[PDB]
């Protein structure tokens, strides 16, 4: 259910801006987001606004 809600905004951002971001939230702290993930069942999905995301490239 949450994946569908996050995917709707991701496609809209893809069509309007050219890129879409969806965060896969896990049972971790806000500082642990920097660390990579090996294997973990997620808690939910949250769409990230394009204007608040800074990406330097692939």
């Amino acid at each position: 259910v949450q994946l569908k809600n996050a995917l709707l905004n991701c496609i809209i951002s893809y069509r309007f801006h050219g890129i879409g971001y969806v965060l896969v939230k896990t049972k971790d702290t806000l500082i642990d987001l920097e660390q990579p993930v090996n294997i973990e069942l997620p808690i939910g999905f949250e769409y990230l606004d394009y204007e608040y995301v800074r990406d330097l490239g692939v």
Binding site: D28, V37, I39, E40, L41
Partner: protein, 89 residues
């Protein structure tokens, strides 16, 4: 030693609760029909995958899958996971 091992069981449960999903909670796991020893080992396996990298598992446990590693070898795996969270913090 019944109480002594209960605290060890509680110790794994506390750290698992703060890192694993609420789907792995002892209450809901009991509803699905798993024994207490099965619940603890299953929780141990998830923690190793979450923190310990796959390469270390392929060395300490000698195999990729942890589905048949419950026991003393699992205790070694979760011991490294306890070290992993310390350096992560």
């Amino acid at each position: 030693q019944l109480l002594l091992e209960a605290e060890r069981i509680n110790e794994i449960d506390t750290l698992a609760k703060a890192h694993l999903s609420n789907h792995f909670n002892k209450e809901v796991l009991l509803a699905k029909g798993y024994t207490l020893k099965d619940i603890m080992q299953a929780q141990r396996r998830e923690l190793v995958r979450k923190f310990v990298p796959i390469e270390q598992i392929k060395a300490i446990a000698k195999v990729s899958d942890i589905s048949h590693i419950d026991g003393e070898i699992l205790e070694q795996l979760v011991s490294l996971a306890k070290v992993n969270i310390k350096l992560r913090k």
